[PDB]
Design a protein around this nucleic acid. Structure first.
Ligand SMILES: [Zn+2]
Ligand SMILES: [Zn+2]
Ligand SMILES: [Zn+2]
Lengths: 872, 734, 280
RNA sequence: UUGAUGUCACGGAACCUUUGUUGUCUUCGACAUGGGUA
């Protein structure tokens, strides 16, 4: 595969000829004092030609072309070669270097075609992308015969300056083994010490260290504060190997350290997959649909006059990420992460032209409300969208921010059990919000300024409705166009056109600085404005309880040694990352989707019991499926104010000994929330207007959101101990079309007086504890009640209880063991200066009585304990 | 319970035995698979009894340790599911589970046979979503080939692997792809294997015969029992076998029997096989494809559905157009050639995806009768994609309007464009001219013309017209002169008698041509100077009725660009601006004259969703067709710019699109006046005023066109001709 | 050995499924059907000991506890003979030995507690402090809800034990149900307070079905939940290692083992609620 | 490293679908020790 890239002079000649036709239209076919033919573009032996023109030739005169046997040819026929006269050479990198293969200069990327109606791709194609920052310049020679007239050369030189794109990119044409070895040490340590259940967790946590090597020095210790962590001190230890790797001078560079953690995590990831010995599923399968366009070779040749009026409108601005975004690009080598983002070779984030055009084309069809059914090949489609898109140019954009992507872990819940489904865990790289991309759109055409469709589209983007990336259903890819400035250039005027040619259209960075001074602030106002497809709903959630959005990988890495930590995300501020706590969009979407699915049925079957593959139930119509994109988009919910996580610790009590059982530590670090200082969770989800105009769709969402508002769908984890309990949910921005559905006092009987009789004598001394002997029969059922629906004949609701102390109560605050000044001292448990009893304390207390009354099992019991007495 | 199954396997399991170890592995494999799916079996929370013994047996099994046999039985469960949705889902699970084993070097052939067969069956179930063949279907058939080639490299004559390789190769041909490289070699080996008495395999041996001319397999084919479910396939196979044996009488007998029992759905592979039979008989110069093609067309033409009066819907079969071209070329009677051509006209052809869109529209408007009929079509086509492979066969007519009903003084000119004949270098365009006043042996004439240059002239005007309307006037005059050069018989008195009115029934892109404005060369003669023209979308819409005796005129205007002076101020009611409610009310009162001046929007993909741009709302074509209590018998309707706005740009020369004029003819409207291209507002005011005043559209339009022709004659300017040419009359009143 | 295989979990699960508590409260493989919320104090705190600063009544005065040592299963399982089994579930009885702690004296000996790196100092609420919490339930049978309410409210004269130092008399709490609200559907929620007696009846009938009249674990549980009445101050404490170590003159652990609490008869003593170990 | 009178490839959004969830009261009393004597 060794060699080098090059550009054919035939491809350059093709673009020059296309530019000459546009210039001859503006000059009405005149170059200086000579007039030009339409040219000849018809050959009888059409088989010899690799490609035939499918577009229509531009028309500037009605006269017949030059004769085949003519003494003189017009300047446009001289350019075509109907007179080598003008020979084009290949364009090569200067110096003729060599590279190992195509992957030494660039990377293949899949470019898909998305079906407009379904929102899903059904075919794709691939191409190598070679970064301009590494290989910017190709050099070549155009050979011109001396018998070529001056008017022809003037047309040629003006056409080179007019030619603005080639090979898919805007252009200016001028004429004049540590990870390998560390993986084995870690794997051997894991295998020697019989700790292989942690191979995947260690791989994910080590990969998260690529952010900075200073994370190694802060790796958590055990609850005692000593280097005895269950993961980093398994062995030397894993921590010492990581600490040695961090201190290595080779890994001192942040770029070298980042590659090391990625290679190490990938090596440990392969080993973890090899361990399992059951059924193995390929998740990404049946995905190859590589279809290439096929040009039509029996296409009718046409000559079309477009008129002498040509105006180019330049729009420069900024595309600012208001949410995390995901431009999907999966590397074949990397398998640890299921979903990856598109980055530049120097690890900068990228906003590609292919995605920008795809969003423009989709939005133009949305404005016209007219799908395009054109196929790849043939003459260009003549609908309003395709004709506008042929006048549109967008420049590929990259950021300054270059920090590693944050990886979000998504699961699928088994709806019958209420737990994670077997093997349903996958990763996704996520680009951060707050990134700024330099935006430049140019439109070329005969209208006065922009078309009304493009004025409305660019106004949509300026209002923050530029949804430009994948993963839209989980709130990825919303941009706003900011600092928009425009100026229309009149290419029909000869003075303006000569000035436009002289500066190569002001498209290079130097020329663009001059042009940005000429631009006027704002956007052209659309004469006929149409409302955007998506409408924003603002959601307010009040939480009088602690909240946690489980992030297991951050728990393993955070300097806090806690077992469970809350999800946090990073915002880009220039080239810095600012962490904030958030409720994940994926988690919130899953809860909302479950609330709809558990109360709706299709043909008597709950929607949770459906496979929802090749399905068109109510749930698939609103939330999408594997065949049709969803019509509702959930964003991350952030917290008003800045609550700081607090730590809670728990112990399981052996039902026989009555003391703390020997179990793995499961302390949690949730965000505090209380009735006095409730958590305020705010964000927005967007819903398509056709969904918002449908009475049955708004009815389905209103019923589900009524159950969330009534505290039936807690947010986050640890719901059993009192976390994530929603006090109220409100929505605004729907004209009450959904919120309209989101809206006796009998005394509780007194307890019976007990019949338990205990006789106590003052002279006796009694033991502090006694044992209740269980019945020998334990009633067990093989299948418990499923969670997939509200079953008929069952009961769902709330119990409100009052607890009163009869003797002094000690529920300690164990965060501070030296409260009253070794001799440990504790204060009573409180949250936000409010005296409380956590639900886990009350849960375990009542569970023990329930086990004894129902004669259940010993739920907490140290079975593997081995007793030992002493000989007498 | 999967757990109870494992426990039973553990009670009686001999590890040296292979029957027990296969059952135990099956119970283990089944339990793991039900866990990955979040099925209701995951609610089983119990464990295995006799833990010390269960642990030892399970530990020995893991040290002793087929994947192929368990998954083979899972595939045999797929072939028995009735619905294609059930089969498509289960094929999804089999493919993803067996992908791991295929990567392994030591991969069992049973594992590879099951996975290749699952890819082939999933490839048959890919539903199209466009004009192109699904790219996934091609990939699925290529993956099945790759897996079989792994087996075939080890054993070049594996019986089942060859069949799966040949099944996928045939479907690649059906998808427009060429045959793979070794198709000739793989086909020879299956012949060496022997003969298989299965319909899905007989076609493979016929392909062998056509390439090797070996007669040993032909007599075996002719002896097959005729008690099978897919009898039409066997009759076609025997007709193919009889043709190689020169038993031409039996080719006719079996070929006719196959067509008489043909499957209802066009997705059935029989239809492409039937067309290939005709193309081969025609290629071998056998004068027997003509009977087959005519009979095939005669049954193919009843595969349509009715969407209200005069509006017919059909589903897309890619080779239906070729079959009609074959039947047209086979038929010799000119009158019967007109019946073939007229069977295509005024019919909307929708893909399976667009039929879902129309199914949803019918559901919204509570049109359950039309929704149920669309459901059967959708299911029947989707359920026939793997019917040949599964060996299943799941279980209307319209009258002909006689040609003598045309009044004696008139002349009818039917058109048909033959794409197949034009590709072969012939004159694909045919004018079928009918003269009621001639002798019955001379009443019909068939004029053949080449439409290649005419179609190119139309596309140049259409592109110049879309980019710069009214600046395309010169290209229009060049186009109108191209009509006469293509069809010079229109200006010959022998072909068309002078002074007699001419009825036009165009086909394809000829519906969008100004046939009445054909120009013959320094003086210039326009067609309307000699004849008065009418237009019909098809001959089967010919239902003359007396005009409406009620005298009342309406002007539904939603056109703010221009104010029509001569039309708005007068005896005509002006309900401007116009909303869908206003339009519906005016339709129900049966006006003598109705004017609808507005804009419209075109839907390229689905003509039933093209809409009239009205005040605060849009009215789709399907909205117009579904209005209840509509009386428009003998009502003369004049349309503004909406008619040209709601027709997409042309893409194929034989494509026809439904517009407002078809929507109004469905309501038995007498006459409809509309322009082919966008009509100048001032000329619309002048032209429509004269028609309403004099109430004789056929005569008045010819007079008005000639009165404006005199102005054009003095200057010969294309700009004036651009404004008078577009107007034409649609419909044939009594 | 079966680490990579999914059937390893089946060797860790009972052949007959899940007990009533593993359905209502769940397992690592099955989600529970109940949710317990944080309790919040309803009034101003009442503290066991006044705080150092009388200005703020929201902090209390420290109290030093005695030594809280690990439970000893070798006491309840005297020897390695297979006749010695796990006696049952441990419940701490209710008593007022916290009054001796408040005075600063040891419960067993009556001698002043001395500060040590082993014992702890706590801020304890007094008796008479009320809390509010809610329990959320989903898909419960009428017998599951009836026993859950029974497990919560218990009966008049019974109480729970919550928090630290349950051996010393700390943690007697009584729960009272005050509202049951049921989800009829997405739009309607009703009041279920009137249907509580029927839920209680079906819970008891479910126990009569499983065990017939053999309900002795229930009666022994209610004796261990029994709360001392008026003018009843049971003396409840652990004996010392030796009789000489006890200033009260009561027996020690050395003297009890060669006595009433011998290995042959110790477990019967421990599983009989309110069994004295000394008479004074 | 192109071929020339014909390249809309800025003619194609890696797009679509999956809740880090589940289960556990910061709880608590009996020893420790190996011989020694004959
Ligand atoms: Zn020339
Ligand atoms: Zn288009
Ligand atoms: Zn569904």
């Amino acid at each position: 595969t060794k060699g080098r890239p090059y550009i054919t002079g035939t491809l350059l000649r093709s673009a020059v000829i296309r530019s000459a036709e546009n210039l001859l239209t503006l000059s009405d076919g005149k170059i200086s004092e000579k007039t030009c033919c339409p040219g000849k573009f018809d050959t009888e032996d059409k088989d010899r030609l690799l490609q035939l023109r499918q577009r229509s030739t531009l028309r500037w005169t009605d006269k017949n072309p030059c004769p085949d046997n003519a003494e003189t040819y017009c300047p446009f026929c001289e350019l075509l070669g109907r007179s080598f006269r003008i020979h084009f050479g290949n364009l090569s990198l200067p110096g003729k270097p060599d590279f190992d293969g195509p992957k030494a200069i660039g990377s293949q990327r899949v470019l898909n075609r998305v079906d407009f109606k379904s929102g899903k791709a059904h075919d794709f194609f691939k191409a190598y992308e070679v970064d301009h920052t590494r290989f910017p310049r190709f050099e070549g020679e155009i050979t011109i015969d001396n018998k070529v007239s001056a008017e022809a050369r003037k047309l040629l030189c003006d056409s080179l300056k007019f030619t603005d794109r080639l090979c898919g990119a805007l252009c200016v044409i001028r004429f004049d083994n540590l990870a390998e070895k560390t993986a084995e040490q870690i794997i051997s340590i894991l295998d020697d010490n019989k700790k292989t259940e942690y191979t995947r967790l260690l791989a994910d946590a080590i990969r998260s260290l690529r952010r900075s090597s200073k994370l190694v020095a802060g790796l958590p210790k055990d609850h005692d504060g000593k280097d005895d962590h269950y993961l980093w001190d398994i062995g030397v230890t894993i921590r010492q190997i990581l600490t040695t790797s961090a201190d290595t001078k080779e890994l001192k560079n942040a770029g070298k350290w980042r590659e090391f953690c990625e290679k190490l995590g990938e090596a440990l990831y392969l080993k973890s997959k090899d361990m399992s010995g059951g059924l193995k599923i390929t998740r990404r399968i049946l995905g190859d649909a590589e279809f290439h366009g096929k040009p039509d070779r029996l296409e009718k040749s046409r000559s079309v006059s477009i008129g002498s009026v040509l105006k180019e409108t330049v729009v420069c601005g900024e595309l600012v990420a208001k949410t995390p975004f995901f431009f999907g690009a999966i590397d074949e080598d990397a398998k640890q992460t299921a979903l990856q983002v598109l980055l530049t070779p120097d690890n900068k984030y990228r906003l590609p032209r292919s995605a920008v055009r795809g969003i423009l084309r989709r939005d133009l069809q949305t404005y016209f409300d007219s799908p395009c059914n054109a196929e790849l090949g043939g003459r260009p489609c003549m609908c309003k969208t395709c004709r506008i898109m042929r006048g549109i140019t967008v420049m590929d954009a990259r950021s300054e921010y270059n920090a590693p992507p944050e990886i979000r872990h998504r699961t699928r819940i088994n709806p019958f059990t209420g737990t994670v489904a077997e093997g349903a865990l996958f990763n996704m790289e996520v680009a951060p919000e707050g990134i700024v991309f330099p935006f430049q759109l140019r439109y070329r055409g005969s209208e006065d300024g922009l078309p009304d469709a493009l004025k409305t589209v660019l106004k949509w983007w300026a209002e923050g409705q530029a949804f430009m990336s994948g993963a839209a259903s989980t709130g990825k890819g919303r941009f706003r166009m900011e600092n928009a400035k425009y100026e229309t250039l009149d290419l029909s005027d000869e003075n303006q056109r000569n000035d436009y040619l002289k500066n190569w259209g002001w498209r290079d960075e130097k020329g663009l600085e001059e042009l940005k001074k000429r631009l006027n602030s704002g956007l052209p106002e659309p004469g006929n404005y149409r409302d955007p497809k998506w409408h924003e709903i603002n959601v307010s959630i009040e939480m009088a309880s602690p909240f946690i959005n489980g992030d297991p990988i951050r728990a393993a890495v955070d300097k806090r040694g806690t077992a469970v930590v809350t999800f946090v995300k990073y915002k880009a501020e220039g080239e810095e990352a600012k962490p904030v706590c958030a409720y994940k969009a994926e988690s919130f979407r899953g809860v909302i989707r479950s609330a709809v699915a558990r109360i709706h049925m299709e043909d008597g079957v709950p929607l949770t019991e459906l496979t929802h593959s090749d399905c068109e139930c109510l749930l698939c119509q609103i939330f999408g499926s594997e065949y049709e994109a969803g019509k509702i988009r959930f964003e991350d919910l952030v917290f008003e104010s800045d609550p700081e996580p607090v730590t809670f610790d728990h112990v399981a009590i052996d039902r026989f000994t009555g003391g703390a059982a020997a179990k793995k530590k499961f302390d949690d670090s949730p965000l505090p929330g209380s009735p006095a200082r409730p958590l305020m969770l705010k964000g927005s989800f967007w819903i398509r207007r056709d969904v918002l105009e449908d009475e049955e769709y708004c009815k389905a969402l209103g019923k589900a959101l009524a159950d969330v508002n009534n505290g039936l769908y807690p947010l986050g984890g640890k719901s059993a101990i009192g976390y994530g309990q929603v006090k109220s949910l409100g929505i605004k921005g729907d004209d009450k079309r959904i919120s309209r559905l989101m809206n006796t006092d009998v005394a509780v009987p007194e307890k019976p007086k007990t019949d338990a009789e205990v006789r106590i004598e003052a002279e006796k001394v009694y033991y502090p504890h006694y044992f209740v002997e269980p019945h020998k029969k334990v009633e067990r059922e093989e299948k418990p009640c499923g969670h997939q629906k509200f079953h008929e004949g069952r009961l769902t609701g709330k119990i409100r209880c009052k607890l009163i102390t009869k003797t002094p109560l000690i529920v300690p605050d164990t965060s501070n063991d030296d409260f009253f000044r070794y001799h440990k001292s504790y204060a009573f448990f409180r949250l936000h200066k409010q005296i409380m009893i956590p639900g886990s304390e009350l849960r375990g207390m009542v569970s023990s009585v329930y086990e004894t009354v129902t004669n259940s099992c010993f739920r907490i019991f140290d079975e593997t304990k081995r007793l030992s007495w002493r000989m007498d | 319970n999967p757990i109870r199954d494992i426990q039973d396997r553990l009670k009686t399991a001999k590890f040296d035995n292979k029957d027990d170890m296969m059952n135990l592995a099956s119970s283990l494999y089944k339990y793991e698979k039900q866990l990955m799916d979040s099925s209701e079996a995951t609610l089983c929370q119990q464990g295995l009894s006799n833990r010390p013994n269960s642990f030892s047996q399970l530990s020995q099994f893991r040290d002793s340790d087929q994947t192929g046999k368990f998954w083979q039985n899972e595939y045999e469960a797929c072939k028995n599911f009735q619905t294609h949705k059930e089969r498509r889902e289960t094929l999804e699970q089999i493919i993803r589970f067996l992908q791991n084993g295929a990567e392994e070097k030591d991969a069992d052939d049973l594992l590879l046979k099951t996975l290749a067969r699952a890819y082939f069956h999933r490839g048959l179930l890919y539903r199209p979503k466009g004009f192109s063949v699904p790219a996934r279907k091609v990939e699925a058939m290529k993956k099945a080939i790759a897996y079989c080639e792994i087996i075939l490299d080890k054993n070049e004559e594996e019986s089942e692997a060859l069949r799966i390789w040949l099944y996928a190769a045939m479907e690649l041909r059906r998808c427009g792809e060429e045959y793979p490289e070794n198709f000739a070699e793989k086909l020879f080996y299956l012949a060496n294997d022997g003969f298989i008495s299965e319909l899905y395999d007989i076609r493979l041996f016929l392909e062998y015969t056509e390439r090797e001319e070996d007669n040993n397999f032909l007599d075996m084919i002719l002896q097959e029992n005729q008690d099978r479910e897919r009898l039409f396939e066997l009759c076609l196979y025997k007709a193919r076998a009889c043709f190689h044996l020169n038993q031409l009488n039996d080719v006719r007998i079996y070929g006719e029997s196959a067509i008489d029992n043909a499957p209802g759905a066009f997705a059935d592979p029989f239809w492409d096989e039937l067309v290939e039979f005709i193309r081969m008989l025609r290629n071998k110069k056998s004068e027997l494809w003509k009977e087959i093609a005519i009979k095939a067309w005669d049954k193919c033409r009843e595969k349509e559905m009715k969407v209200g009066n005069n509006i017919y819907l059909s589903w897309y079969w890619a080779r239906q157009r070729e079959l009609y071209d074959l039947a047209f070329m086979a038929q010799d009677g000119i009158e019967k050639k007109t019946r073939i051509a007229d069977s295509l006209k005024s019919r909307t052809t929708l893909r399976i995806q667009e039929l879902n869109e129309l199914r949803k529209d019918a559901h919204r408007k509570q049109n359950r009768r039309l929704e149920d009929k669309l459901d059967r079509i959708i299911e029947q086509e989707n359920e026939a994609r793997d019917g040949a492979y599964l060996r299943r066969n799941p279980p209307g007519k319209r009258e002909e309007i006689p040609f003598a009903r045309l009044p004696q003084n008139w002349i009818a000119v039917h058109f048909y464009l033959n794409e197949l004949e034009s590709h072969e270098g012939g004159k694909g365009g045919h004018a079928l001219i009918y003269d009621p006043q001639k002798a019955e042996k001379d009443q019909w004439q068939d004029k053949s013309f080449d439409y290649k240059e005419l179609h190119r002239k139309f596309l140049e005007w259409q592109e110049n017209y879309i980019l710069n309307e009214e600046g395309s006037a010169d290209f229009l005059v060049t186009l109108c002169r191209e009509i006469e050069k293509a069809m010079p018989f229109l200006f010959k008195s022998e072909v068309i008698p002078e002074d007699r009115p001419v009825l036009w029934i165009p086909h394809g892109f000829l519906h969008r041509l100004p046939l009445h404005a054909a120009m013959k060369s320094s003086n210039i003669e326009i067609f309307w100077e000699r004849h008065a023209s009418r237009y019909l979308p098809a001959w089967h819409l010919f239902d003359p009725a007396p005009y409406s005796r009620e005298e009342s005129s309406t002007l539904l205007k939603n056109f703010e660009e221009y104010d029509f002076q001569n039309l708005e101020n007068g005896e005509i009611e002006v309900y401007a601006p116009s909303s869908p409610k206003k339009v519906k009310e005016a339709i129900r009162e049966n006006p003598a004259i109705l004017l609808l001046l507005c804009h419209g929007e075109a839907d390229m993909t689905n003509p039933f969703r093209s809409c009239l741009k009205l005040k605060n709302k849009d009215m789709t074509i399907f909205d117009l067709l579904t209005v209840e209590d509509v009386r428009l018998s003998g009502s003369r309707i004049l349309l503004g710019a909406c008619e040209s706005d709601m027709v997409p740009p042309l893409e194929f020369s034989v494509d026809e699109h439904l517009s407002v004029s078809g929507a109004f003819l469905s309501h038995k409207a007498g006459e409809i006046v509309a322009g082919l291209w966008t009509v100048d507002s001032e000329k619309v005011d002048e032209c429509y005023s004269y028609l309403v005043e004099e109430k004789d559209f056929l005569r008045n339009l010819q007079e008005w066109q000639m009165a404006e022709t005199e102005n054009f004659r003095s200057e010969n300017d294309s700009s004036l001709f651009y404004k008078i040419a577009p107007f034409r009359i649609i419909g044939f009143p009594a | 050995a079966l680490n990579a295989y999914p059937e390893k979990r089946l060797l860790l699960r009972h052949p007959k499924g899940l007990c009533p508590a593993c359905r209502l409260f769940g397992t690592g493989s099955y989600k529970g059907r109940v949710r317990f919320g944080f309790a919040s104090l309803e009034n101003d705190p009442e503290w066991l000991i006044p705080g150092k600063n009388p200005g703020d009544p929201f902090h209390g005065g420290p109290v030093m506890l005695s030594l809280l040592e690990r439970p000893r299963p070798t006491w309840s399982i005297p020897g390695s003979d297979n006749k010695f089994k796990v006696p049952g579930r441990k419940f701490y009885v209710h008593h007022h030995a916290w009054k001796t702690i408040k005075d600063g004296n040891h419960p067993t000996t009556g001698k002043a507690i001395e500060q040590s790196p082993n014992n702890r100092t706590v801020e304890a609420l007094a008796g008479g402090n009320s809390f509010s919490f809610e329990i959320a339930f989903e898909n419960l049978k009428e017998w599951e809800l009836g026993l859950l309410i029974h497990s919560l409210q218990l009966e008049k004269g019974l109480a729970h034990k919550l928090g630290m130092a349950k051996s010393m008399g700390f943690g007697s709490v009584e729960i009272d149900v005050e509202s049951v609200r049921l989800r009829k559907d997405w739009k309607q929620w009703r009041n279920g307070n009137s249907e509580i007696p029927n839920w209680l009846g079906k819970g008891f009938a479910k126990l009569k079905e499983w065990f017939r009249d053999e309900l002795d674990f229930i009666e022994n549980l209610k004796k261990l939940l029994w709360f001392p009445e008026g003018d009843q101050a049971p003396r409840v404490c652990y004996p010392m290692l030796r009789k000489k170590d006890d200033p009260n003159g009561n027996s020690g652990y050395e003297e009890l083992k060669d006595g009433e609490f011998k290995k042959e008869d110790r477990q019967k003593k421990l599983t009989t609620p309110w069994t004295p170990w000394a008479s004074s």
